[PDB]
């Protein structure tokens, strides 16, 4: 999924 990890990190990402 989305290369952040935790995802929250890049909420400009629409897949975070």
């Known amino acids: 999924g989305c290369p952040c990890e935790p995802s929250?990190?890049?909420p400009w990402?629409?897949?975070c």
Do not use: A, D, V
Request: hydrophobic fraction near 35%; charged fraction near 0%.
């Open 8 to 10: 929250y990190l890049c």
């Open 13 to 15: 990402l629409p897949g």
